[PDB]
Each structure stands twice: as C-alpha cells, then as structure tokens.
Amino acid sequence: EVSSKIPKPNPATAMRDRKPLYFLVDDGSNRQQRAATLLRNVDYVIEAHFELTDKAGAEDNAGKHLDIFRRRARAG
RNA sequence: GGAUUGAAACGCCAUGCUCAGGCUGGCGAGUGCGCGCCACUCAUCAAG
C-alpha cells in the first residue's frame, strides 16, 4: 500500500511550467506494506427504517422513499 | 446524493547446476544310451 495522501495542487501554478505531477509508490518510504485480518464467507440481514431530516421538503415522505428502495433492491 | 476508521494503494526489479569419469579383466554342457522283439491280401467271379 501507499504511505500518504496526494497533496492538494495549485491549478494555475501547475502549468506555469511544463512539469509532471505524481506520487511514486515504490520510492523508498512511499511503499507501506499492510496486513489485514479480514472475514470470510459472510452473510447478514440488515433491518433498518427511514427518518425524515430537516432538509425534507413537503412532498418528501418516508413511505415513498421506502417503496423506491424496495423497487431498487428487488430489481438489483 | 455528505460521510460503509471509508475514500487512493504492484512484492517488485534479476540470477548456468556446472566443469568430468571403461563395467571391466576370464570361465568345454560334458561324460553315455539297439525301436525292438512278431504278423497270408486272401477266400470267388464267360468273352460276347
């Protein structure tokens, strides 16, 4: 894996000169080996329900989103 | 359409099993051992 996030660039400064921007993965300390102890052959059933937020409009109702989600899940 | 301690994340670059070394030197299948002792093709039937 990689050691650090890529830096935030300066767009205008980037092409004041013709130069590359990159992160070299295998350049010394940039390479970080990370192990993972992870699960196998999992299977879950999730029980959940909706709740309207302060951003909800008048036309927004929990039942409509519930049926939309059910349609999407049934159709894959 | 804001957030699944998430979002991004090569084990990777390369390295003759090689150089070589008789399975050889030599050793009779051999000495010997009757297929042999006997046994009618024979008793008949013109040529037309």
Side-chain angles (χ1 to χ4, degrees):
Chain A
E1 307 224 313
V2 150
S3 70
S4 63
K5 305 167 181 174
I6 68 178
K8 177 222 315 304
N10 177 308
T13 299
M15 68 295 258
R16 288 189 202 291
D17 53 349
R18 174 163 286 155
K19 75 157 141 53
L21 292 172
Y22 47 67
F23 182 91
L24 292 167
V25 301
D26 56 341
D27 184 18
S29 172
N30 287 8
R31 172 60 70 212
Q32 292 290 314
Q33 300 195 315
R34 294 169 69 174
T37 319
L38 80 184
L39 303 165
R40 300 288 267 96
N41 302 329
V42 302
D43 197 347
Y44 304 96
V45 165
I46 300 162
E47 302 201 2
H49 68 88
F50 275 105
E51 175 173 292
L52 290 165
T53 65
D54 293 354
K55 330 254 280 193
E59 65 304 14
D60 289 319
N61 164 274
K64 329 327 206 318
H65 293 83
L66 266 182
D67 71 55
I68 289 162
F69 173 95
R70 286 174 183 144
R71 272 196 295 288
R72 281 186 181 189
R74 287 179 197 130

